[PDB]
Amino acid sequence: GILKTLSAPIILENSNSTFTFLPGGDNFEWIHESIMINAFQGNTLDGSTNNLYLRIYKDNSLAFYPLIGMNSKSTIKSGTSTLIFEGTAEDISYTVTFRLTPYGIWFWDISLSGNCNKADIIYSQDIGVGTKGSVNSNELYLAQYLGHSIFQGDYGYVICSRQNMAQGDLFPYLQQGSLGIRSIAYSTDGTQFFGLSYKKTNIPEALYGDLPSKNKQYELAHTALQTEAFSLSGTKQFSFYGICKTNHPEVIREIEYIQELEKAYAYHESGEILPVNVPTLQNIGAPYASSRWDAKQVEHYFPKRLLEEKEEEALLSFFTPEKSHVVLQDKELTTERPHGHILMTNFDVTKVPQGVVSSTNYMYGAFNCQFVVGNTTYNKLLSNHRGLLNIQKDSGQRIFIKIGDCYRQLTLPAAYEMNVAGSTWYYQLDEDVLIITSFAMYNRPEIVLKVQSLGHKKYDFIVTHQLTVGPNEYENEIKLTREGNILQLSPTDPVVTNHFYPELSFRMRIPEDCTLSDDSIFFHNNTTINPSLLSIEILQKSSFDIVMQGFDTGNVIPFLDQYDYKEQLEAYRIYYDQLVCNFKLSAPDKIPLSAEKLNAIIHWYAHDALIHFASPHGLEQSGGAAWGTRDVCQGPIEFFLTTGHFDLVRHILITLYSHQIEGGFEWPQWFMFDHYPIHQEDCHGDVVFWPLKAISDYIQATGDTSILNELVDYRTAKDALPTNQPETILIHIKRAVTTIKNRYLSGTALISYAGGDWDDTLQPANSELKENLVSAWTQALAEQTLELLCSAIKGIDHDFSKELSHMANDIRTSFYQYLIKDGVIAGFLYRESEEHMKYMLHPDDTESSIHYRLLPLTRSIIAQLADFKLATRNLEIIDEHLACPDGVRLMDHPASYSGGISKIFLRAEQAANVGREISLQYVHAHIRYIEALATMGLSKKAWDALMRINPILLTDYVPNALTRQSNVYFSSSEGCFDDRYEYAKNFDKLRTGDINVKGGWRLYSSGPGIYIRRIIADLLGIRFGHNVIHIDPVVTKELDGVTLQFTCFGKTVFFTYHVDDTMDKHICVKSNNNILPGDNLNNIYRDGGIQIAKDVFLSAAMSDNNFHIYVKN
Ligand SMILES: [Ca+2]
């Protein structure tokens, strides 16, 4: 069987514009030249995100009615460039006329007829303003670069928007406004129009009041306009309009195109405008959200609760002894970003895995999005989650339940419980609880949905599935066959998947008594519209399940007879315990809260890190799939080195070196690590150092110099294919080091900035910046890396090792010679020649508002490159200029913003949204601050810094932080500033905590893996070396008497901390009162810890496994 693909049946065309609509008149794709104007495509059940609303005001009520789309119940006629909606709302007759002109200009002409005392209209339009590929790839990211300017025109507010991130080399533009009626209020973001409360009510919050008339630059670009209120006694007519320009290189300064708009407004189509049939939903009600639970209910279902978060006495979230995190309904209605989770199948932790199965889900009834096997972009069964507020609620697997006469879609539950193995939703119904579970199977490529009525009451259900079978919905036909209760789905020939994973298929085991259809069952006349919405109707059951299987290589296995969550939960618990070497902090008295938070979060961060590594995608950042070259070298390698997964790291490193690029001999920015030959051959200037640093760290930890002799291929730049001309890794390293020599600025060993550094928003805006900038951070990283490489290679290739020592010395010399003035390391040097040099991000740059950069200050400490006196100064600088209650910031003032055009840095000057790196508290960099503090032995600061970015009970620790999902990593902390100008003007509020801050994108980051390393390796001080253990704690008095359980060289040991500032020596380690012999570690800033031989350590542990660590902090 072949499932057809959805094509929008209403197609309007004019000149260079094609605007398509679904049969109810919902926007599908609005394209002008090569720019997509809407942000979200409509779907056949929800409609689209845009609308026009008529509101009617009475003495005892306010009412609101959509005039367009499938929910208006409007009749429709179309022409070649015109669409006419007709209907009535209460006693008012309306017609809406959509006109697409030849001028990249459209109109919504509204005519109202009847009698009423007071009414208004609200125009509502979600906007993308990018290429189709950019919009579909990440609407959130696109919106961050869409800068809005607000003006007063002839008819009140007009909204002009410029896309600041280049789209096919163009900077596209929109203008929206009203004609013939005043727009007296406006808004620009979805969170302002729909509100968080939508996630429960399904009603846009703005419809009960007046728009705020503020421009919020966030991630849901969404234009709304509210008309003046009016009376009707007869017929009244007015319009909204839009203008799209594909290229607007200047910044916006005023309302433009006034003459074109006037001409366009006179345009009408000559053709006949004829009726079309509108399929209508039948017995489908509004969505169903659970009622909230009270205290007794919560206590009954969750009698054992830890780390409880309460606001105004309402419980918002908590953790359980079974290592779950539970979120109550009220918390979702306060968090701007939706609570969610990623499930992933276990794999063999000695090798880089392939074919890992993953699924995503969210609290508001998205039970299974983006089901994948291996590649998270291409090897996909179910569509990706999009947006934030679940206005479009079709993606993946969704559930309708019949309540009264109507099927109603499940949305927001009373509670949502997450475990590394699965998610559970609790919906309170009238005298029953429906429990929905979505969970991963252990040792099998499967995700399981289970539905169960707690009272064993029967219901009717429809479970919908937005299939892709390939990278995207609505792109290609799908093969579907059935044998009994088993469905098999596989891609048709044109799909890219089909080419590199020709045996890829999925299977679903469905319930015995169900019926299968597409969306036809939702409609009064049974018309199929979307043929790839796979709908399963299940009648009168009190429970059922759906089991999903993924096979990238065709290794089809039978279904089990029984699918039990509890057994998977126990097996995943053990798997994660082993991953973190049975980490557990304990004390005889009450454990300190910081230890309690670590015990609660560590497996969550291990799960996040494991996803980042093996199935790369996030909640917001659903498009990943590849390894970032610098990223795999950080989060995953640091996590695995910390925990002793050395075989895994070796394989990672071999894989990584095989992706080095022939001819250039640097690495791509990112690459697929599976059979898809896809990479980004253009890279930042820091990227080349990471694989060099990582191999060195591995060699130092393990002694495994054999890796250097492995024969490994390269990849071609344009094609990403193997060259089949392998060389030893040692020679890979030599070629990479040659590229580094070639970066020297003439007469120096200063490394040119080239494509940029760690901060992806700081790409140079022109070629001269590319050649003549030097990043002090890059310079420092280069010194660190070449020294590590020197040591790693010393016993293998004497000469190469000597040359690395000299290069490192030269680089170190240039760092001290050029990049430091008045004791302050400059962020950058701009050098045309010895005669023409200037600092940036240094106090000497008196023309700039930016005088200090974090990165060089931490990197120079971590590398032990900064001498003691300089390092001390770096810390004073951080404290005075960079330290905030929500963490340390990246620079002491924001980057330039002047309407979206770049002068020095690219994305930093283009982002209209205060978020991500632009927030200046990008949590990954704060984690490196912690690594620097640990290097200096500064325990009080280091532990305080660890807690400032720990999501558990964050709002109690950082009083100006807004609450966020407590069991997942957050990537950034951003002040609640509506735009870049207010951010620059009141930046100092961040220092003092006089503005609230909120969390950024979730889960997918190097952050979790590196945080884990800070905890274990740098603070608790347990590190592994070649046949040695290093014990080097940086702990506060609070850890006195606390014990760590940790598995070392396969043996579980217990490390008890005694913190004694009066001791003679810096550290002493005892077991059964015997002092362990060892040698002192090297550290230029403080007394180092101790290195103990593996055999001595293990021999001691066999006798008595409780090691006592006496340390003077
Ligand atoms: Ca104590």
Residue numbers in the entry: 1 to 1113
What is written in the article reporting this PDB entry?
The crystal structure of apo LpSOGP was determined at 2.0 Å resolution. The crystals contain two identical molecules in an asymmetric unit. The two molecules in the asymmetric unit are in contact with each other mostly in the Ndom1 region. The contact area is only 2.5% (935.5 Å2) of the monomer surface area. The overall structure of LpSOGP besides Ndom1 is basically similar to those of GH94 CBAP from Saccharophagus degradans (SdCBAP), ChBP from Vibrio proteolyticus (VpChBP), and CBP from Cellvibrio gilvus (CgCBP) (the RMSD values are 4.11, 3.53, and 3.29 Å, respectively). As for the substrate recognition region, two helices (α1 and α2) in Ndom1 constitute a part of the catalytic pocket as well as in Ndoms in VpChBP and CgCBP. Ndom1 appears to be generated through domain duplication according to its position and the structural similarity to Ndom2. This duplication monomerizes LpSOGP but retains the fundamental constitution of a catalytic pocket between hetero domains.
In this study, we identified the function of LpSOGP, determined its crystal structure, which is the first one among phosphorylases acting on β-linked glucan, and clarified the binding modes of substrates. In addition, LpSOGP did not show phosphorolytic activity toward cellobiose or laminaribiose. These results indicate that LpSOGP is highly specific to SopNs, as LiSOGP is, and is completely different from other GH94 enzymes in substrate specificity. The tertiary structure consists of four domains: two N-terminal β-sandwich domains (residues 1–257, yellow, Ndom1; and 295–553, light blue, Ndom2), a catalytic (α/α)6 barrel domain (593–1020, green), and a β sheet domain (magenta). Ndom1 is unique to LpSOGP, being missing in CBP, ChBP, and CBAP.
